[PDB]
Symmetry: D3
Subunit: 273 residues, 6 copies
């Protein structure tokens, strides 16, 4: 299964040489446990939790679904299996749920503020090591959309790249044959001129990086009139305070890496009996 190895590694780091408790547990037995919320938020991590339980021979009796909202004291999951295994898995289970839900929850807050159905919210490649796929998945559960998953997914030319590109148009024109047939090319721009030049060069997507709303609206209006098929993306420390403003700029999407890199754990715990 696609994420099985991920769960194996998550567990392995916690068990190390082997759980010490099972060495002294006088008698193992079947038991039921509940994952309860101690804070409100939106649920994420279901796909991983279920794969983890199945892998460890733990039964998932009941569980709320990804994207579902919850309140403190709410029971999020009911699991049953060997007492020794419920304990060996406890932390790994909670940590992945609290982290995933943390991202989904923070993300849902940005979805509300953005308040739009025409403009999608996006993440970035700023993700914690080994957690890209995990965290991208978590953003989906917050109600937003994902940007590319890696460096093979699409071509994104930013400031650093552009400095070594004499004549963008020529570059983009002859880059197509060396890129996979289905690849889009995005160009990071920091001024109306740059974006305009990007569009004329043959950019599939143009990012309006660190630009005022006015500056962005100008570029969006220009795009609508001359390059109707170029997607526009706004980004650059966009906050909960300014996200709505940019939603009205005319851009197609808005990316904020904070959805992932400023997310924190939603409080939860596991209780027996």
């Amino acid at each position: 299964m696609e994420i099985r190895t991920f769960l194996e590694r998550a567990l392995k780091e916690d068990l190390g040489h082997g759980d010490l408790f099972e060495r002294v547990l006088e008698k193992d037995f079947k038991a039921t446990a509940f994952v309860r919320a101690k804070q409100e938020g939106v649920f994420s991590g279901e796909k991983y939790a279920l794969e983890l339980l199945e892998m460890t021979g733990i039964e998932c009796v009941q569980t709320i679904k990804d994207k579902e909202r919850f309140k403190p004291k709410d029971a999020l999951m009911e699991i049953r299996g060997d007492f020794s295994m419920l304990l060996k898995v406890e932390r790994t289970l909670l940590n992945l749920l609290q982290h995933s839900s943390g991202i989904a929850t923070l993300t849902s807050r940005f979805v509300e503020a953005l308040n739009s159905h025409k403009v999608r919210l996006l993440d970035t490649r700023k993700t914690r090591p080994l957690l890209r796929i995990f965290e991208k998945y978590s953003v989906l559960n917050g109600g937003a959309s994902n940007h590319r998953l890696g460096l093979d997914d699409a071509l994104m030319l930013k400031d650093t790249h552009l400095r070594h590109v004499k004549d963008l148009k020529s570059f983009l024109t002859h880059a197509r044959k060396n890129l996979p047939f289905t690849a889009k090319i995005e160009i990071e721009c920091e001024s109306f001129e740059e974006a305009k030049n990007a569009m004329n060069a043959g950019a599939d997507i143009v990012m309006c990086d660190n630009l005022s709303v006015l500056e962005t609206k100008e570029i969006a209006a220009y795009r609508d009139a001359h390059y109707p098929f170029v997607l526009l993306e706004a980004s650059g420390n966009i906050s909960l305070e300014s996200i709505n403003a940019y939603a009205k700029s005319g851009v197609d999407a808005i990316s904020v890496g904070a959805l992932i890199h400023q997310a924190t754990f939603i409080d939860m715990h596991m209780k027996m009996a």
Copy 2:
């Protein structure tokens, strides 16, 4: 070495099928880049960064050391290697430095509030999946200390476990032979009676869970008089506000999972030329 595989996997999830840019880069060449801070903070991730650079054939010309304070616009590292590789590693390098430094920085703030050289600040087993070792290492660079690293490091018995133990003293006495000779046993207690009882039962360490400063002080005073070599730990939603007051209870340590699960990325970026 110990963390090479970690870096390989971190990089692998970003490269996927293969970096697209290197497919169109007309000509590769050696270049120098600098990792610059965009916020104030304490550096962390040095050990991982250097291994990452060495693995990819990138030279580390200069770098500040783990634990060093830095300010915005400060050059954290200077590296040199193939342009294509610098770009292929950039995000992986920045993500691990921003995450690790975020933890160290938040941690350094609790250390400040703690304001004590006798009491130790500790993390918890609440870490992000696959990042146990990474994050525990980050807490150290913040100036705090680590709690156990896993379920194999020490035995920690709490409510969940205790509910199934008839005679705690008997259990601990006969548990030593089935545990590695060097392991310590910690008992989580929610009352003075419980703490006192755990000490008599033979606990090496007692956790004063969710107790007031006064409550904790009473336990510490009892420990000092009757079980001088038993270690005391305070925990349970300790904040930057209450942390100092707890440092005066007489407890030996104070654990706060938030050091890791409430930490966020410190802002940085990489610049060429």
Copy 3:
């Protein structure tokens, strides 16, 4: 190295428990070997071969480059290292070069018959197990272009997918929110009505699957008329005798799986001398 693992596994399956010759070679010594052609074709596998020698401690004294033409008796590579190691890697080296060159060479012939700079030759996801990246790379060295690398690279919908779909336009308009921001959506069509239907649905790419030049040209002219930004791809048993004809249907690309699944080894061998 992104392909380092690939090479370890290739070498491992041939050495098994361990090479038997090294068990009897009384004295090892530094030696030189040459990789010569016994056929003519285009070279491919340079990237993998160099990493292979690097890994095994063999020195690459000289080597022609990928894409370079060669003919019988040509010395393609000169290598030097321990005699035992040269024999242990011999077969692994030749097999990947002969297989890679085989694909590039067969690909270059289709490149000719195509004879065009306005039309791109594309491969397919029809590749040998565990050799995708290896074979897509081999095609490039043949002068052609690669199609997507996998199922994560882009969304390719065919009747199978749309079978249980009734409003293509709405279906795609919603897929966008759930697909990564940079992903293109291609639709396979076996009739004019389908292509025309796709373009109106909002497809980024339309495949003219198993259709006549007249049928293709019909779709092209239509595309040229109303949807100029919709790439068109022709495929379906395109042969080395009909590729040129389709290149004149006004299609942007022509994909042929045969480039990979019909390629065969190019005769080569290694001599000590």
Copy 4:
């Protein structure tokens, strides 16, 4: 499963970050699919395909067996499972069956032209990277026999090895002590004098490399005369037009690498219906 890892890796290289279709499929459901032929040939890959479906949770309702002949339009397999999973494994399934069957089919033709039960058809160590075991297995399903599986399986010495050797008889008499007790030693010979030399040296097998039938027959008659227990193998560009002739030289086996390195995919496809 001995080949379980092989299948995980084959599937992994196609899914990459994750299949994009499952991201948009609003509702998954159980479905059935058929693997049909578009050509005729001998089936191969049964073993790998079953393990593949097992791994992915797809049910194999019906399937022809390895070695079984088939013709265009024949339904080779009937499978059932989640719609999303059938699409995710489709290509991986077909590629291995088409590639495996391709080798078995080409192998069966050489089996005919050979037309003999006293002579064995053998493959070579010339196989595609990472596919040795897979391709040797494929040859068997073609009706032929496998040669050694690797360099650990047996000792095969050629001029390259003996170049710096002056007493074959003593050299081999000593190799025995250093080789595993059960290993056979084969020697490649390009002249009568060499074969005659090998047999006297104590070789278990002699290869008649790139020699005429008359030359081969000379060595055979000699073998039949003094060394009846020395297997003889003929090889060296043996073609589908000269294989039968060599089979009459009194040789025990004829190896032809082309069985694998010249085989190509057999046209097949998958339909839902």
Copy 5:
């Protein structure tokens, strides 16, 4: 689970390219086999055996438990599965049971000689490569106890380390903050003075290395009077002959690496029908 990978690798080294017998087995079929002892001893390896059987699809009908005594001709296990698999697993199954039981048996003999329920018998970090966890587990089944499991479990300072420590007390005092909160520190001492000094410096455990019984007694008596909670361990070529005398010195434990490094295979075999 925790040891599945271990069993996979154990099996993989025996199967290599693939079991030859299954290539000629005319027809496979279900069969029952018994693992029988050919010597007297204490059973060990149950946990590994069961995981091994489950992994390979073999049913465990019956089995004695770890720690149980057995005699020659005793049936240790009864299993059922495919004939081919039983043969493919036989050696792997027997090797791990004979090795593990050999350790448990030798261990049970030192336990007998020790003749005490207050003193613990311990192993060491002297284990065979890749078998640390396997062998530590085997010692337990012999009735003894385990020492630390690795270099991460506890801190052990001996001659090599001490030679570079100016002030031992200072070092230990300031080392606590840099070690996991739960770790114990053991000091290896070669004299009464050293032991006494280590106790004053703050050692959690003191090893009485290569000291006479009288010497060890003096240290134990000192510990009892001044450092009651410091743990004492005796070691250094302790034999079956001297072990009992040491158990009377007052020390808490006695470690002997020989339990593992001088253990040998207990004789067993597998029978069909």
Copy 6:
């Protein structure tokens, strides 16, 4: 490198979460260490030790070679590198050397007793899990020879197999085509009749299992007269006391699994300065 992964895993199990000492080492520095013998024996493990040192960045200044004899107090290796790394590697280095040398030494004792240059000493497939290749290598350094390395190396039909083989001759005759061309077939026999039947059936090798010397001589004499090309092997709890007797039986080789499964650690240690 073929055994690199083996060493990585050996180290990994000892380091676990990470060496605790390096956490408190005030200052690292370069240092020299010596591996000294504390008991006489024959050296084995060189190949692994060197690969281990190179992997950990430790320099091997001096080292005796595999097969070389040593006496107590003798310095076997002189290594230099970071103090922290010499300590992290110490146990892994010693354990592999003491175990390998232990096997080589025990083996050399059997070589002497056998006292022959015409009869080779052999091992079996009775090896500790994960150590087959390691232990087979160790036997070579004792002065003996190896039997097959696994189940793919050769075909060995024993009692269990034979029970399901009606008509051996027919079986062996038609098994050749389904086995790799170079494979030998050995048959385990427990009586003159069985061996005779084995020879007539077409056995490449015949094992004289659990037979008296007389019984074996009879079979050897029969072999010399009728099947001069069949190799003979004696086995069945052959000891140091009876090995010489069997050497005079006329058999080609003698196998004793004890060379490996009854071997124990040769005492050694590491000293600084």
